[PDB]
Design an enzyme around this catalytic site. Structure first.
Site, PDB file in Angstrom:
ATOM      1  N   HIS A 200       2.279  35.251  13.982  1.00 47.55           N
ATOM      2  CA  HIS A 200       1.651  34.926  15.242  1.00 47.55           C
ATOM      3  C   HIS A 200       2.397  35.659  16.351  1.00 47.55           C
ATOM      4  O   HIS A 200       3.376  36.329  16.094  1.00 47.55           O
ATOM      5  CB  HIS A 200       1.700  33.415  15.521  1.00 47.55           C
ATOM      6  CG  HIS A 200       3.091  32.894  15.627  1.00 47.55           C
ATOM      7  ND1 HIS A 200       3.833  32.515  14.536  1.00 47.55           N
ATOM      8  CD2 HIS A 200       3.933  32.811  16.691  1.00 47.55           C
ATOM      9  CE1 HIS A 200       5.058  32.181  14.927  1.00 47.55           C
ATOM     10  NE2 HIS A 200       5.157  32.376  16.231  1.00 47.55           N
TER      11      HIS A 200
ATOM     12  N   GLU B 233       9.861  36.070  23.814  1.00 49.88           N
ATOM     13  CA  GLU B 233      10.736  34.907  23.738  1.00 49.88           C
ATOM     14  C   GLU B 233      12.187  35.350  23.797  1.00 49.88           C
ATOM     15  O   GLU B 233      12.940  34.992  24.714  1.00 49.88           O
ATOM     16  CB  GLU B 233      10.382  34.071  22.515  1.00 49.88           C
ATOM     17  CG  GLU B 233       8.985  33.507  22.601  1.00 49.88           C
ATOM     18  CD  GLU B 233       8.785  32.258  21.820  1.00 49.88           C
ATOM     19  OE1 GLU B 233       9.110  32.244  20.620  1.00 49.88           O
ATOM     20  OE2 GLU B 233       8.291  31.267  22.415  1.00 49.88           O
TER      21      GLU B 233
ATOM     22  N   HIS C 284       6.044  37.268  15.532  1.00 51.38           N
ATOM     23  CA  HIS C 284       6.895  36.497  14.623  1.00 51.38           C
ATOM     24  C   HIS C 284       6.228  36.444  13.252  1.00 51.38           C
ATOM     25  O   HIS C 284       5.130  35.913  13.109  1.00 51.38           O
ATOM     26  CB  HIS C 284       7.074  35.095  15.155  1.00 51.38           C
ATOM     27  CG  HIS C 284       7.928  35.047  16.366  1.00 51.38           C
ATOM     28  ND1 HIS C 284       7.935  33.989  17.245  1.00 51.38           N
ATOM     29  CD2 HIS C 284       8.833  35.942  16.818  1.00 51.38           C
ATOM     30  CE1 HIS C 284       8.808  34.244  18.201  1.00 51.38           C
ATOM     31  NE2 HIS C 284       9.381  35.416  17.963  1.00 51.38           N
TER      32      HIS C 284
ATOM     33  N   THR D   4      10.822  27.940  17.855  1.00 49.23           N
ATOM     34  CA  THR D   4      10.682  28.053  19.305  1.00 49.23           C
ATOM     35  C   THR D   4       9.533  27.212  19.867  1.00 49.23           C
ATOM     36  O   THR D   4       9.320  27.212  21.071  1.00 49.23           O
ATOM     37  CB  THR D   4      10.532  29.483  19.796  1.00 49.23           C
ATOM     38  OG1 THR D   4       9.240  29.945  19.408  1.00 49.23           O
ATOM     39  CG2 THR D   4      11.627  30.394  19.300  1.00 49.23           C
TER      40      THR D   4
HETATM   41  N1  LIG Z   1       7.914  30.724  17.087  1.00 53.21           N
HETATM   42  S1  LIG Z   1       8.378  30.287  15.695  1.00 53.21           S
HETATM   43  O1  LIG Z   1       9.686  29.682  15.684  1.00 53.21           O
HETATM   44  O2  LIG Z   1       8.077  31.284  14.708  1.00 53.21           O
HETATM   45  C1  LIG Z   1       7.283  28.913  15.271  1.00 53.21           C
HETATM   46  F1  LIG Z   1       6.029  29.163  15.679  1.00 53.21           F
HETATM   47  F2  LIG Z   1       7.707  27.786  15.895  1.00 53.21           F
HETATM   48  C2  LIG Z   1       7.166  28.586  13.731  1.00 53.21           C
HETATM   49  F3  LIG Z   1       8.373  28.666  13.193  1.00 53.21           F
HETATM   50  F4  LIG Z   1       6.400  29.513  13.161  1.00 53.21           F
HETATM   51  C3  LIG Z   1       6.569  27.207  13.361  1.00 53.21           C
HETATM   52  F5  LIG Z   1       5.440  27.059  14.008  1.00 53.21           F
HETATM   53  F6  LIG Z   1       7.400  26.256  13.766  1.00 53.21           F
HETATM   54  C4  LIG Z   1       6.333  26.990  11.867  1.00 53.21           C
HETATM   55  F7  LIG Z   1       7.415  27.150  11.164  1.00 53.21           F
HETATM   56  F8  LIG Z   1       5.896  25.776  11.637  1.00 53.21           F
HETATM   57  F9  LIG Z   1       5.409  27.787  11.413  1.00 53.21           F
HETATM   58 ZN   LIG Z   2       6.790  32.294  17.406  1.00 47.92          ZN
END
Ligand SMILES: NS(=O)(=O)C(F)(F)C(F)(F)C(F)(F)C(F)(F)F
Ligand SMILES: [Zn+2]
Length: 258
Positions: free
Chosen positions: A92, A104, A117, A196
């Site tokens: 995403h 970020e 990510h 995040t």
């Molecule tokens: N931004 S991120 O840390 O990749 C995140 F979207 F929070 C994520 F890790 F992908 C998340 F959503 F928490 C998940 F791991 F659940 F997929």
């Molecule tokens: Zn992310």
């Protein structure tokens, strides 16, 4: 209040529902390039995406994601700072309302227009829900986006976004090859951090590539036509879906390169 990115529900509010928001290993962070230490013991990152199987593309009201079959070792991340094997679950993006914000992570305080990510979980824990409960459960590969030339391998993604405009919409999204989103170099920074978004679990080994990819203005404009809202609700553009840099505290960022 369901959490979001607005004035009354955004990042400065998240600690009320998720007190780990003020924890010791939160993400993202500013990467101060002069203080990151080169670690000659860090291995090259191993990205094995040849057998990836994309499934669906989804607007979750916070981002859009492309999901993969993670029931076998088909698209895996290994090496780098990691022990063992991490399966690709989804990718995403985070992006801004204008090109000067959206990432970020930051690099010497510089914000990029967006950040990709690629989310992977450690197979030793068997499923992603178990993995998020562990300090070495997830590995997220972060890639900066700057605006200039188009990224051809992104176009299949942007062309379907009109089909998932509002929260709750999804579409079949098969045969997408995430190798077309990667820059030439796999040089990286790494540090221990967190999700995040809520629940902000402190379960992630972050791997942030030094080299950004370039995307066109037309490609990022299509991101900015997405909606945070569900269909029938007042239209609120999905923009500025990024958490700001958090305190580094007692952490060292390590570089794979000189
Ligand atoms: N931004 S991120 O840390 O990749 C995140 F979207 F929070 C994520 F890790 F992908 C998340 F959503 F928490 C998940 F791991 F659940 F997929
Ligand atoms: Zn992310």
């Amino acid at each position: 209040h369901h959490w979001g990115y607005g004035k009354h529900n955004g990042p400065e509010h998240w600690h009320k529902d998720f007190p780990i928001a003020k924890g010791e290993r939160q993400s993202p962070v500013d990467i101060d390039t002069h203080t990151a230490k080169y670690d000659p013991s860090l291995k090259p990152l191993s990205v094995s995406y040849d057998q990836a199987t994309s499934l669906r593309i989804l607007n979750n009201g916070h981002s859009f994601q492309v999901t993969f079959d993670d029931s076998q070792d088909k698209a895996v991340l290994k090496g780098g700072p990691l022990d063992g094997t991490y399966r690709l679950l989804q990718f995403h993006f985070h992006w801004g309302s204008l090109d000067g914000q959206g990432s970020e992570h930051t690099v010497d305080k510089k914000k990029y227009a967006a950040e990709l990510h690629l989310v992977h979980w450690n197979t030793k824990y068997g499923d992603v829900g178990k993995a998020v409960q562990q300090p070495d459960g997830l590995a997220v590969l972060g890639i900066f986006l700057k605006v200039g030339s188009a990224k051809p391998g992104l176009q299949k993604v942007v062309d379907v976004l009109d089909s998932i405009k509002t929260e709750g919409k999804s579409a079949d999204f098969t045969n997408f090859d995430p190798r077309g989103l990667l820059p030439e170099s796999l040089d990286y920074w790494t540090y221990p951090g967190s999700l995040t978004t809520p629940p902000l679990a402190e379960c992630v080994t972050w791997i942030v590539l030094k080299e950004p990819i370039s995307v066109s203005s037309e490609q990022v404009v299509k991101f900015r036509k997405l909606n945070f809202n569900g269909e029938g609700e007042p239209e609120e553009l999905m923009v500025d879906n990024w958490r700001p840099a958090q305190p580094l505290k007692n952490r060292q960022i390590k570089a794979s390169f000189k």
